[PDB]
Every structure is written in C-alpha cells, then in structure tokens.
Amino acid sequence: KPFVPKLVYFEPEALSYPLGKELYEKFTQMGIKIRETTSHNQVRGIPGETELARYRNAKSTLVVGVRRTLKFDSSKPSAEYAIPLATGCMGHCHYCYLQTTLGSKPYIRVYVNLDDIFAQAQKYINERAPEITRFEAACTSDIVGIDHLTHSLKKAIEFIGATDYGRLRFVTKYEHVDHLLDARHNGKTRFRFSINSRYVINHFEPGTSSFDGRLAAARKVAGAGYKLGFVVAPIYRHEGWERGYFELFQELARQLEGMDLSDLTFELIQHRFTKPAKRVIEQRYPKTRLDLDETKRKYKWGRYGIGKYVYRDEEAKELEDTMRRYIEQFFPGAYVQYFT
Numbered sequence: 001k002p003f004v005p006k007l008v009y010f011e012p013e014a015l016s017y018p019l020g021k022e023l024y025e026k027f028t029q030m031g032i033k034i035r036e037t038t039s040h041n042q043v044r045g046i047p048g049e050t051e052l053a054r055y056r057n058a059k060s061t062l063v064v065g066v067r068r069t070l071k072f073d074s075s076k077p078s079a080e081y082a083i084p085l086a087t088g089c090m091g092h093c094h095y096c097y098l099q100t101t102l103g104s105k106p107y108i109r110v111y112v113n114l115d116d117i118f119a120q121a122q123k124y125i126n127e128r129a130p131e132i133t134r135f136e137a138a139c140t141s142d143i144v145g146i147d148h149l150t151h152s153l154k155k156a157i158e159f160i161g162a163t164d165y166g167r168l169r170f171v172t173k174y175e176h177v178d179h180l181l182d183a184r185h186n187g188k189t190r191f192r193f194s195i196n197s198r199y200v201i202n203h204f205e206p207g208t209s210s211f212d213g214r215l216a217a218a219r220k221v222a223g224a225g226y227k228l229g230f231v232v233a234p235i236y237r238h239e240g241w242e243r244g245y246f247e248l249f250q251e252l253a254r255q256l257e258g259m260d261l262s263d264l265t266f267e268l269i270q271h272r273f274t275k276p277a278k279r280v281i282e283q284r285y286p287k288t289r290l291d292l293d294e295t296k297r298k299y300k301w302g303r304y305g306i307g308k309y310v311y312r313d314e315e316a317k318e319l320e321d322t323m324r325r326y327i328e329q330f331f332p333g334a335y336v337q338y339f340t
C-alpha cells in the first residue's frame, strides 16, 4: 500500500544528480513506464480522454525534476518558510486545498537538487540566527507519503538536525514512516499527523491511511524520539460534529495511553474553500457529500492571494472553544499552537 507511481517522467537535467540517477535505475528495474519531460513545469501526454481521467492519472504520475526556483515561499502559521522537496499528492481528499493551489499540476513532483535546496535553507537560517527558523516540508504535498521512494525527507531531517538554529516540521495522513525511525533528527523535527472525526475521514479522505494507521505511525515516531503533533483539519461542522470531535479526542487519548506527551502540540484549521475551488471539486468528486454552501460561511477577502469562505466568526469561535476544551480534558499540558 505504499505509493508507487504507474507512470514516471524525468527532466533530462535530473539525470545529472545522484537522486535522479538512482530513481532512474530504480524505476527502470521495476519495469515502470518512464518518459522524458522538457520541464517538470509542463509534462505532456498524461493519459485520459477527459479532465477527471487525466486528473486521476496525474495523481498516479511521478515527475523527477530540478528545483529551479530556490527562493522559498513563506509558510505562516506553521513555519517561516516552506522547504520545497516535493509538490502534489497521491491522496484524494475531497476538500483538499491543493485542488486550487495545484489545479493544473496534479502530478507528484520530487526535486533531486538537494544540495542546492539545503544550501538555500542554510542561507535563510543564517539570515535570521540566533533566532530559530522553522521550515514546513508538507506545504504542498504529502512528503511523508512519498518519501519511501526517495529518502529526501530523511536527508532534510538529518540536515536540519545538524544545524543549530533550524527546525523542521511536516504533517501527513500516511502510515509509511518506517524508513524515518532511525533518522538522526536530534530533536529538531516535529512529526505531525492530520486527524479528524470519523465522519470526515470516512466520507472525505479516500486514498489515505486509516485513523488507526496514522496513530500506529504516531506511536512509532514518538518511540523514535521525534517531537509529536497533530493537526486537526479540516474542522468541519457536519451533523453531530460536537460529539464527533469529542469521540476523536477520546479515541486519540486511548491510542496514546502510557506515552510521554509532555511536548505534544495541536494545530487547528477550520474548513476553508475558494470560489474557484467549488466548481473544481464539483466535477473532480461529483458524488461527494462535502457541503460548499457559501451562505453557511463568511467570505474572508484576500490580501496577496484570493479570498476564501470560512465559518462565521461566532461558529468559528464555537469550534475553537470546543476543541480547546477537549484538548484540555484529554491532553492536559498539551499546547494548542493556533486556530485558523
């Protein structure tokens, strides 16, 4: 069940890097169909005679390229910067914000020029030191879910672990963490899992690991000394959400029974969606029960980007207050980093 692509593209230039060569050798040996692409920013001939088909097939397609944009995006509130190791995901979460963010590039891209990327990360760390600089590695991908193929995240973990002022963090819905358990993280990596109510997981998170799988993985990473965290997102006011999210934290507490949870973090994100995201979702997941009724939402206008629908302030406050109380009840001492 670990992700393996059905189609792989290589940029010619990727072959000049160790990871490029390694991946080319691996995938040719596996007998996977391999193609050449002139830029990972434009891949041709992904199969499908319809949009939804090419979309589905794109999500089983890997592209091995070189990161040419070495300026890092901001990644608040998670981190100062997004470290670009991969883009895209094999998951099919109905609400996924990547459907607008990566609308046109739904294939999984991994970058092979780690030397360049880690060098630039160090430059950012240097520019702010002795202030701590955090990097988010899962801004635009499930980096953990694909990493068994590349070990790029493992390399990033060990790179950051060697710095004084750098810290790393990422979040996943995948359980395939075994190759990361012996990484020399040096306590500078927060390993997070996305969790949610039974309703949201069962109806909206196909193609991801089960809740039990995520928690089995969470026990493994805490066992290996990683700082642990959870991202409760998207917080979605389904019928019976109040008891739905109560049952989440109750089951969470039961699944972490007898563990050191002295440095446990929670991050809380309410469901959000853009106007372009709606009609996109409607034809990528035509039978979803996801509610995208804008009349049940308030519009938050954009600053540098486009705006989005979130819950009205009072309903958003109810969610925040309720999650905080459950976290206080079941995980005393645990730190809620933000609600948004």
Ligand SMILES: C[C@@]1(Cc2cn([C@H]3C[C@H](O)[C@@H](CO)O3)c(=O)[nH]c2=O)CN([C@H]2C[C@H](O)[C@@H](CO)O2)C(=O)NC1=O
Residues within 6 Å of the ligand: 074, 075, 076, 077, 078, 079, 097, 101, 136, 138, 139, 140, 171, 267, 269, 272, 340
């Ligand atoms: C995993 C994330 C990473 C992240 C992504 N992003 C970007 C990536 C993408 O371009 C966009 C999607 O709205 O959000 C961001 O600005 N800040 C982040 O912290 C996900 N997010 C989302 C939530 C919201 O859409 C946006 C800002 O809160 O980031 C978050 O707040 N916490 C995280 O830890």
Ligand SMILES: C[Se@@+](CC[C@H](N)C(=O)O)C[C@H]1O[C@@H](n2cnc3c(N)ncnc32)[C@H](O)[C@@H]1O
Residues within 6 Å of the ligand: 089, 095, 096, 097, 098, 138, 139, 140, 141, 142, 143, 171, 172, 173, 193, 194, 195, 231, 232, 233, 234, 235, 269, 270, 271, 272, 273
């Ligand atoms: C883009 Se997700 C990338 C990392 C990894 N593949 C993962 O799924 O955890 C980052 C987080 O944001 C949430 N999230 C995704 N879409 C939305 C959304 N529309 N509203 C509100 N939240 C949304 C997801 O549940 C994740 O907790």
Ligand code: SF4
Residues within 6 Å of the ligand: 088, 089, 090, 091, 092, 093, 096, 097, 098, 140, 141, 142, 173, 208
């Ligand atoms: S696992 Fe994360 S990035 Fe992948 S489809 Fe789901 S929400 Fe989107």
